[PDB]
Design a protein around this motif. Structure first.
Motif, PDB file in Angstrom:
ATOM      1  N   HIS A 143      -1.858  -3.534 -18.872  1.00  0.00           N
ATOM      2  CA  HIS A 143      -0.661  -4.210 -18.389  1.00  0.00           C
ATOM      3  C   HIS A 143      -0.933  -5.128 -17.205  1.00  0.00           C
ATOM      4  CE1 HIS A 143       3.333  -4.116 -16.056  1.00  0.00           C
ATOM      5  NE2 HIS A 143       3.440  -5.018 -17.016  1.00  0.00           N
ATOM      6  N   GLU A 144      -1.875  -4.769 -16.326  1.00  0.00           N
ATOM      7  CA  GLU A 144      -2.153  -5.608 -15.162  1.00  0.00           C
ATOM      8  C   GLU A 144      -2.610  -6.995 -15.584  1.00  0.00           C
ATOM      9  OE1 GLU A 144      -4.730  -2.653 -13.310  1.00  0.00           O
ATOM     10  OE2 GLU A 144      -3.636  -2.896 -11.424  1.00  0.00           O
ATOM     11  N   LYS A 145      -3.480  -7.071 -16.592  1.00  0.00           N
ATOM     12  CA  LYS A 145      -3.821  -8.366 -17.172  1.00  0.00           C
ATOM     13  C   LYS A 145      -2.650  -8.941 -17.961  1.00  0.00           C
ATOM     14  CE  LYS A 145      -6.101  -8.703 -20.971  1.00  0.00           C
ATOM     15  NZ  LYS A 145      -4.951  -8.789 -21.915  1.00  0.00           N
ATOM     16  N   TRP A 146      -1.858  -8.082 -18.606  1.00  0.00           N
ATOM     17  CA  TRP A 146      -0.738  -8.558 -19.411  1.00  0.00           C
ATOM     18  C   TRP A 146       0.450  -8.972 -18.555  1.00  0.00           C
ATOM     19  CZ3 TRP A 146       3.863  -5.993 -21.881  1.00  0.00           C
ATOM     20  CH2 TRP A 146       4.390  -6.784 -22.908  1.00  0.00           C
ATOM     21  N   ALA A 147       0.639  -8.347 -17.391  1.00  0.00           N
ATOM     22  CA  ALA A 147       1.715  -8.763 -16.497  1.00  0.00           C
ATOM     23  C   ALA A 147       1.365 -10.026 -15.725  1.00  0.00           C
ATOM     24  CB  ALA A 147       2.060  -7.637 -15.522  1.00  0.00           C
ATOM     25  N   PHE A 148       0.092 -10.197 -15.357  1.00  0.00           N
ATOM     26  CA  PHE A 148      -0.290 -11.294 -14.470  1.00  0.00           C
ATOM     27  C   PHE A 148      -0.053 -12.654 -15.114  1.00  0.00           C
ATOM     28  CE2 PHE A 148      -3.592 -14.277 -12.998  1.00  0.00           C
ATOM     29  CZ  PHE A 148      -3.230 -14.373 -11.668  1.00  0.00           C
ATOM     30  N   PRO A 192      -5.414  -7.504 -11.735  1.00  0.00           N
ATOM     31  CA  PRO A 192      -6.495  -6.860 -12.482  1.00  0.00           C
ATOM     32  C   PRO A 192      -7.849  -7.346 -11.999  1.00  0.00           C
ATOM     33  CG  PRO A 192      -5.519  -8.591 -13.807  1.00  0.00           C
ATOM     34  CD  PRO A 192      -4.722  -8.536 -12.530  1.00  0.00           C
ATOM     35  N   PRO A 193      -8.751  -6.434 -11.648  1.00  0.00           N
ATOM     36  CA  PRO A 193     -10.071  -6.848 -11.157  1.00  0.00           C
ATOM     37  C   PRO A 193     -10.947  -7.362 -12.290  1.00  0.00           C
ATOM     38  CG  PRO A 193      -9.979  -4.468 -11.319  1.00  0.00           C
ATOM     39  CD  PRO A 193      -8.602  -4.968 -11.681  1.00  0.00           C
TER      40      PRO A 193
END
Length: 121
Positions: A13-18, A74-75
């Motif tokens: 989600h962090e990649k999908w939210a960003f 996302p790192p």
């Protein structure tokens, strides 16, 4: 594997939210053309059960089969390249997408009432 696996759905989600804020999908009701919003603007660390149909046990068995044989950041994951010890293992991880889902794919067209697809290779 452990309670840390619940934070892997965060990364997905962090990649999908960003990128949604990056691409005008901000927030407010859902994904829509007239709205252009981000439905689930919320971290998965303390999440409801609506994503348990995608993440959790389906992503657990993704990380459990291996042992057998709001602007989140996302790192970067490519810090260490996958050498041949692990590169051919991703060759097997991609095989899971055609084994776990591919077996369902064989059981998807055979549980609807017919149909054939060339993907069954």
């Amino acid at each position: 594997l452990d309670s840390f696996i619940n934070k892997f759905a965060e990364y997905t989600h962090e990649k999908w939210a960003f990128d949604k804020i990056q691409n005008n999908w901000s927030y407010g009701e859902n994904v829509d053309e007239e709205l252009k919003t981000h439905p689930m603007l919320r971290p998965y660390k303390t999440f409801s059960e609506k994503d348990k149909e995608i993440y959790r046990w389906p992503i657990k068995e993704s990380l459990k089969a291996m042992i057998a044989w709001y602007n989140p950041q996302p790192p970067d994951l490519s810090g260490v390249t996958l050498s041949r010890e692990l590169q051919a293992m991703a060759e097997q991880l991609a095989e899971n997408y055609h084994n776990t889902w591919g077996r369902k794919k064989k059981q998807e067209l055979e549980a609807k009432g017919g149909g054939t697809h060339p993907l069954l290779v």
